[model samples]
Target: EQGKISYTPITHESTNTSIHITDLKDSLNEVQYKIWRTADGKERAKSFSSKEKEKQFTIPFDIKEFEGKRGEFQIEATGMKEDGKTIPLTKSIITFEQKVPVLMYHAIDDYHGQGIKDLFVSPANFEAQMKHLKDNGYTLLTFERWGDINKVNKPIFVTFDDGMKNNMNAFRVLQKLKDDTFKPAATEYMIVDNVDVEGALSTSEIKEMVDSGIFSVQSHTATHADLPKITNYEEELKGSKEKLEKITGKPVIAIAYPFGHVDDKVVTETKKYYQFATTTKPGQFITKGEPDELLKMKRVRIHHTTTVEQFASSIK
Candidate 1:
């Protein structure tokens, strides 16, 4: 008394233009498709009559027209039964460029601070988050190497700020999960002056993290000073970059603004030395490699009290 249809995406040897559809109940008489323009719901439709019962078919699309578009588009399919009943088969979103989710972390241990408790994520929770990404097929990347959108598969950036000593707990979790396909890595924004101080990572500790090949250390400024508040942008911006590059022997090309502070001057100063900079503004990082936009990217903050379920939804 009921008809069922199954449809899913299929890659055609270097192309993503077709989908495989099956008439599971031998009841489909026709198939219909709608290609929606993501910006709006405006869509184009096409229909084809089924020639055989209980058979599989390949539906092709002209995906070129939508290429290079920034927004997300969708392909929807439905099967019409001989009895005039319709079964929705599939709905898949297509994105021309990658939509990266950049997650911000501060302390990677239990917090007793009077400040924002949300800045700290427990070690157990951090491990769960990393495992969630691995189980769900997400590719973790550092901020320095996130520009290669073509190579990314379910890409996400895990960044730790302030370079807390406890942040090594997060790095170790990534190390435990490191593999050819599930290589988890994170970028640490180190405050140059804060290193060796209590609760902050020391020079030796930072080198160890960097040498582990699971962490990339970048400048968070010479003293984690608020960029907008400081008139000496050269010291806070350029000085920190020089100091970190000297220490790690690697180019420090990215930064997370201390206190999530940035403005016209901050952005202008950041572009001089860094390729990318993240702010506390809450949103997904969607870009096409524009320098100006990349200089002040948005990040989704992972709070201390954020549940695993909430963390799962934030990245999605």
Candidate 2:
């Protein structure tokens, strides 16, 4: 008989971390096994042994070798029956990637529903947006993965404004991006108290998304207050970070100022809580530098009217 069998390797360990794979087997006369990794559409055989019979193997490679690689593998097993017949079992392919892009998404239902300029994206448009990203060379990274940025590459951050139920379009867009090379990661800036019941993602939904490793939860602010106008900069800057960290169980290190409104005081106050605070200011990724310049980084804001060519140019 083919007998029962299972095999998988944990791949989420620290970068270049060693991984061990174990084989589970049921009743069988004799078990023969081999490991294969998917490389360029071909199954490349890996050396394995049956002497131990424990049915576990470890990848000898380091994290650098698997940095950009994503996909699953097949654990092929064979056995012989008393009648001299061959039995076989193959483990389901499991896919994993070590790098991710921190994505930003906006409103999902309608562009004019909540009246956020250049922030709201229609569901149809949202699908197209994700499709564009998928077609392009981009990988989504979660907040946990964002915790280790150095090991990742080609990341795009998606954020959604005004937690709208209709923003479920964000989820749909994310699903489509879950293909071979693209993983969806996003953030939603909650307005905290004011728009609590409006078009925002509920606390439960936010937690669900965070747990999914596909999105990050962050604070727009307790009141979505404009930092420049708020005199109590301490509360607005420090309070928001504390609130988000408490909720997500993940470090809150970045912020998108309400209304994209920010100032020198805002930056100074925010630096106490976060290492990176982004502004609506337009710019491309610059090589990291001194403390002052690196503290507040600029980002290219993608607009609805932005052409594909213009968008591509902006990122470069």
Candidate 3:
């Protein structure tokens, strides 16, 4: 009995904020999680040991501490069975201050017939787009970071229209952004009904990307209907916020009007629901106004036909 084999418990990795670990045998009595800073490679924090706990645990941390740092931080966790046995798993990596280039994506399949060729970029080209961004020192940003400050100086925003499954190609491209320090950021405007079936992003895929931190789940509207011309502007505004937030389980702070329609009334109604609204009209400078200043806020649209040289220059 004294010569029995000693098995190592599975150790997992996570970050300062929180993490989920899964697939544990019911024999475990305790789970222990540890946190570390990527820059210094030192153990900075730890969680209390739990008894007969669920398969998942969340490691918490302060966001301000990571406001402006370079490199990936992580959490390493281990599960202990009731008999003092252990299980090990790999740690999770969290990157801070990594600037990302925003890229736009649309339908993945050719069902729409690519009638407006000017707006469609193929999945192959999308991968090339990401490679170009990476080779040129660009990283992605979450829609959340668009309004927040971080250490990375080079960041970009990628937006897509119509919530097409074609956007899934872009999401897959982001999966290739495994650098951890070079994550990609993107946002999608769903035509409420368009997001569910044939043409738009499935709710499951959208939620998956949101949880991965590579994209922001926001709203376009209940329908691809024009915001400026709508009779019930409040409903148009509130409806988009309510529907998108419901599916994403996140806040809807932004919206990009269909056909880029926008005006004074549109801006006024939009402010009641969103922190920012984007238009198709071309310009520069991220919006900074409150409810009243929204109408005057402008955005720049990078077309599918834009040359890489021009693209790089404009973002700069």
lDDT of 2 by residue, 163-275 (tens): 66666667766866686667777776666553346556666776777777776666666777888887876677678778767667777766667777876777787777766
Span of ten consecutive residues with least summed lDDT in model 2? 14-23
lDDT tens digits, residues 60-170, model 3? 354445453433445566777567777764455554433333344555433356556667766655666667778876645556765442334455667777777767777
TM-score of each: 0.70, 0.60, 0.61
Q: Please report how far candidate 2 places residue 303 from its true position, in Å.
A: 1.9
Q: Report residue 55 deviation for candidate 1 (angstroms).
A: 29
| Candidate 2: segments with Cα more than 4 A from true spot | 1-105, 112-114, 142-151
lDDT of each: 0.76, 0.57, 0.61
Query: Model 2 Cα displacement at 162 (Å)?
Result: 4.2
Clashes of 2: 23
**Model 3 error, position 166 (Å):** 0.5
What is the C-alpha local distance difference test score of candidate 1? 0.76
